Amino acid sequence: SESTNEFGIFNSLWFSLGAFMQQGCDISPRSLSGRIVGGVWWFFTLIIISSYTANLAAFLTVERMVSPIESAEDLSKQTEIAYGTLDSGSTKEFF
Amino acid sequence: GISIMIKKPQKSKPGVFSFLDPLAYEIWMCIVFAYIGVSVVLFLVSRFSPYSESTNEFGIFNSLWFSLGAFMQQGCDISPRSLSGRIVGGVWWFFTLIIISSYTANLAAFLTVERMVSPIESAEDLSKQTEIAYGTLDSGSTKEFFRRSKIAVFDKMWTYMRSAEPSVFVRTTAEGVARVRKSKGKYAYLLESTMNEYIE
Amino acid sequence: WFFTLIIISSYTANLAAFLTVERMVSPIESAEDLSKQTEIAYGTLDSGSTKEFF
Amino acid sequence: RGVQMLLTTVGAFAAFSLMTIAVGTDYWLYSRGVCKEVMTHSGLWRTCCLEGNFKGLCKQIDHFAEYFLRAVRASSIFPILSVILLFMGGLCIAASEFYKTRHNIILSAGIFFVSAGLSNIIGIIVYISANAGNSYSYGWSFYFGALSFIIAEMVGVLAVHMFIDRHKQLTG
Amino acid sequence: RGVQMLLTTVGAFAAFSLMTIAVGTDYWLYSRGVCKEVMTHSGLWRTCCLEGNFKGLCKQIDHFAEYFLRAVRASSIFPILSVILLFMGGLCIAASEFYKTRHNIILSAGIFFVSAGLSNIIGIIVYISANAGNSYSYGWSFYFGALSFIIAEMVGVLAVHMFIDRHKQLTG
Amino acid sequence: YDKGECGAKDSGSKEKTSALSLSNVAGVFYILVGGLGLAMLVALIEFCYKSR
Amino acid sequence: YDKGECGAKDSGSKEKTSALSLSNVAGVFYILVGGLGLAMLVALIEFCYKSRA
Ligand SMILES: N[C@@H](CCC(=O)O)C(=O)O
Numbered sequence: 001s002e003s004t005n006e007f008g009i010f011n012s013l014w015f016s017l018g019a020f021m022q023q024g025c026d027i028s029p030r031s032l033s034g035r036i037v038g039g040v041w042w043f044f045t046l047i048i049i050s051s052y053t054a055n056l057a058a059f060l061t062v063e064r065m066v067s068p069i070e071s072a073e074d075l076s077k078q079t080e081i082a083y084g085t086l087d088s089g090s091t092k093e094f095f
Numbered sequence: 096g097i098s099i100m101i102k103k104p105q106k107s108k109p110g111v112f113s114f115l116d117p118l119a120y121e122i123w124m125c126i127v128f129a130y131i132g133v134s135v136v137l138f139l140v141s142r143f144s145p146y147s148e149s150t151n152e153f154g155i156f157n158s159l160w161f162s163l164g165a166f167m168q169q170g171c172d173i174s175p176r177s178l179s180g181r182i183v184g185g186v187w188w189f190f191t192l193i194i195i196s197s198y199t200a201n202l203a204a205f206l207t208v209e210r211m212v213s214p215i216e217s218a219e220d221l222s223k224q225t226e227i228a229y230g231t232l233d234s235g236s237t238k239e240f241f242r243r244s245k246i247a248v249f250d251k252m253w254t255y256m257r258s259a260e261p262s263v264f265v266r267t268t269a270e271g272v273a274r275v276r277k278s279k280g281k282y283a284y285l286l287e288s289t290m291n292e293y294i295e
Numbered sequence: 296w297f298f299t300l301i302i303i304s305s306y307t308a309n310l311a312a313f314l315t316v317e318r319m320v321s322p323i324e325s326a327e328d329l330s331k332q333t334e335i336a337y338g339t340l341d342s343g344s345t346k347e348f349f
Numbered sequence: 350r351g352v353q354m355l356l357t358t359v360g361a362f363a364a365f366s367l368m369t370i371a372v373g374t375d376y377w378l379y380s381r382g383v384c385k386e387v388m389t390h391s392g393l394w395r396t397c398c399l400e401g402n403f404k405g406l407c408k409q410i411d412h413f414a415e416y417f418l419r420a421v422r423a424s425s426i427f428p429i430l431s432v433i434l435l436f437m438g439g440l441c442i443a444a445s446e447f448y449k450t451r452h453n454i455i456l457s458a459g460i461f462f463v464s465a466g467l468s469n470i471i472g473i474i475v476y477i478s479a480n481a482g483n484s485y486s487y488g489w490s491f492y493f494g495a496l497s498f499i500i501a502e503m504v505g506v507l508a509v510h511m512f513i514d515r516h517k518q519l520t521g
Numbered sequence: 522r523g524v525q526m527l528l529t530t531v532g533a534f535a536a537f538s539l540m541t542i543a544v545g546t547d548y549w550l551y552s553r554g555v556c557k558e559v560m561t562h563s564g565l566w567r568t569c570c571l572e573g574n575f576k577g578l579c580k581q582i583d584h585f586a587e588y589f590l591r592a593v594r595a596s597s598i599f600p601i602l603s604v605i606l607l608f609m610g611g612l613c614i615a616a617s618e619f620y621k622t623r624h625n626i627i628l629s630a631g632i633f634f635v636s637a638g639l640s641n642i643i644g645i646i647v648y649i650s651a652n653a654g655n656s657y658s659y660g661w662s663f664y665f666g667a668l669s670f671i672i673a674e675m676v677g678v679l680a681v682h683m684f685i686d687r688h689k690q691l692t693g
Numbered sequence: 694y695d696k697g698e699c700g701a702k703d704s705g706s707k708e709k710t711s712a713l714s715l716s717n718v719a720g721v722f723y724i725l726v727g728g729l730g731l732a733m734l735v736a737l738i739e740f741c742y743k744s745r
Numbered sequence: 746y747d748k749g750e751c752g753a754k755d756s757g758s759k760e761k762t763s764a765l766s767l768s769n770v771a772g773v774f775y776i777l778v779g780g781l782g783l784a785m786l787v788a789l790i791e792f793c794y795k796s797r798a
């Protein structure tokens with residue numbers, strides 16, 4: 001009698017994908033354990049989506065360039081940015 | 096060099112459930128009652144005789160399953176047939192449409208405010224900020240410097256140090272540090288940078 | 296579906312930000328801002344005793 | 350199967366008892382307050398002070414456009430309505446031992462329970478909307494009211510299930 | 522036909538091997554530290570130093586409401602339980618060469634494989650959370666775990682499908 | 694001017710938001726409950742219409 | 746130099762940048778996992794019912 005329902009593995013992957021995206025999924029679990037599984041998954045996707053949209057909205061409101069370096073220690077860890085004192089400057093002799 | 100000293104700002108450890116914080120406890124509670132009542136009423140009105148009760152699928156369990164689909168806005172497999180059931184559906188739809196929008200809006204605002212904190216930087220705006228207090232050692236050379244220098248910002252610093260009471264002055268470095276440590280955020284201290292570099 | 300999910304979210308976020316920026320327009324007031332504002336400019340008549348007073 | 354009468358006859362009396370007890374106790378809320386501040390307990394009608402020398406002192410509650418809303422809080426009519434309707438609902442099943450074969454004395458039982466629950470819900474919402482205007486928290490009566498509402502719902506559901514079953518078998 | 526038994530047993534074996542290797546290798550994380558700053562690599566149990574004079578030195582990890590969550594990271598119980606249950610599942614299907622006509626072996630091993638897989642998600646979540654309590658980049662063991670999880674999620678579906686097919690044929 | 698104190702005019706300290714109160718949305722609950730109350734009555738009047 | 750004993754500072758990468766941490770939404774995953782874990786027992790009791798019809 002087994003396989004009296006649509007929920008093969010392929011169709012299950014399809015349903016869960018459509019459920020994440022908030023899209024029309026025709027088949028229904030019709031059964032307690034399946035409905036239980038369905039519930040929490042909708043709750044999860046709702047929370048995730050709301051968080052994403054909120055955060056992106058905040059991100060576009062205020063901008064901050066962030067300086068790449070701050071310290072002589074960074075100048076010791078230098079990637080490419082060359083540096084030097086004035087020539088003939090007594091700072092050179094100090095160094 | 097002379098230096099300013101402050102407490103660390105405390106790190107904003109997340110909570111295990113911090114995501115609920117936009118919406119407050121009472122609403123989260125009352126949603127449950129609204130859900131239960133709506134489901135029960137939908138069942139009752141659906142299964143009172145149409146004139147014969149075998150004519151529709153809206154049994155108790157199906158009635159509980161329909162409403163949960165509606166709240167999370169993921170559609171449904173079945174739709175109520177009669178006028179009364181359609182009324183109930185429309186009402187519940189409007190309710191969820193309001194709630195979900197309010198939640199999203201509030202969360203966005205909550206994150207947004209956090210960005211523009213703009214914490215104290217270069218500390219020179221202690222000549223301009225006034226919510227945060229700052230101290231100086233008694234008899235220290237610093238106590239002479241602010242009377243004896245006359246640059247406008249240090250003039251208003253010295254005016255503050257003159258006028259503010261309980262006084263900015265302190266007898267010892269140890270108990271000044273104790274004052275800063277206990278008076279977290281609101282209080283500050285002036286000291287030699289060498290000593291701060293030892294302490295911190 | 297993924298394409299839709301990205302686009303609609305971006306639109307909503309941008310519209311909210313756009314309306315939010317306008318609220319903090321905070322126009323010039325009380326002539327106090329002219330102590331600090333320098334994007335504006337201002338001046339007076341010449342030979343007016345306003346100039347002597349100032 | 351038949352036995353469902355034995356169950357649904359139980360809960361209604363319990364729900365009545367719980368709800369009336371909840372109306373009758375001075376422990377809906379913990380808050381700062383006074384009885385002419387100190388930590389305080391209150392019911393719907395009155396306030397009594399603890400945690401100090403006056404412990405046991407009491408006074409009647411402070412009763413005092415949206416103005417007309419105030420009457421709703423001041424009366425607290427909704428609890429009372431729910432109690433009376435629940436009583437009527439129980440009397441429905443108490444009646445249905447006689448006048449059998451009508452089947453229709455049962456019908457109204459669920460309606461009374463539903464309406465009482467809706468009233469209880471409104472009452473709670475009103476109470477919160479009024480009082481929230483301080484590290485407060487709720488006293489046991491509040492949860493008694495919630496549980497009472499839930500069980501009233503369940504009893505209504507199973508009573509309607511009984512009227513669905515018992516009448517259908519006559520209809521073939 | 523049939524040989525899917527071989528494929529599923531191979532899959533279980535490989536998942537078990539990957540999981541035990543992952544639990545047994547100091548390749549979860551690269552970070553800065555000192556085996557009491559230099560580039561440092563971490564297993565779940567121990568901190569070991571490279572890229573310097575102490576290369577090959579190791580020390581026991583520093584393990585020290587969320588008060589109770591602390592012990593959950595320290596025990597790493599979910600990895601161990603996942604391994605134990607995958608071992609259980611694999612050994613069960615290995616017995617299916619005898620004691621036949623009952624078919625409970627296959628369903629039970631399926632449930633074991635599925636529950637074993639779920640366990641590893643918890644383990645990952647726990648580990649990634651606790652380590653936040655910079656500059657980091659994941660070592661190969663993390664991916665050996667991910668692969669073990671993926672293979673565990675694969676094999677159980679095929680085993681349940683085999684049980685269904687070998688049982689359903691009683692319909693014809 | 695030496696006695697100027699209230700720099701709070703310039704919002705020298707920044708508020709922080711808090712969660713919505715039940716009052717801030719309470720209105721919608723009344724609408725819902727009223728809708729359900731109306732919804733029950735239709736069924737009875739329908740049944741009485743079909744009582745003959 | 747021996748006496749300094751605290752140096753933990755954000756380096757290589759930074760916490761403060763923009764993105765939500767896993768911890769910021771951590772709670773939701775536990776609820777999900779528990780939800781999936783519960784539904785097994787329902788099927789098991791459904792089996793235990795029918796298996797002696
Ligand atoms: N002012 C410096 C020259 C600049 C420098 O030392 O870099 C001097 O007197 O020598």
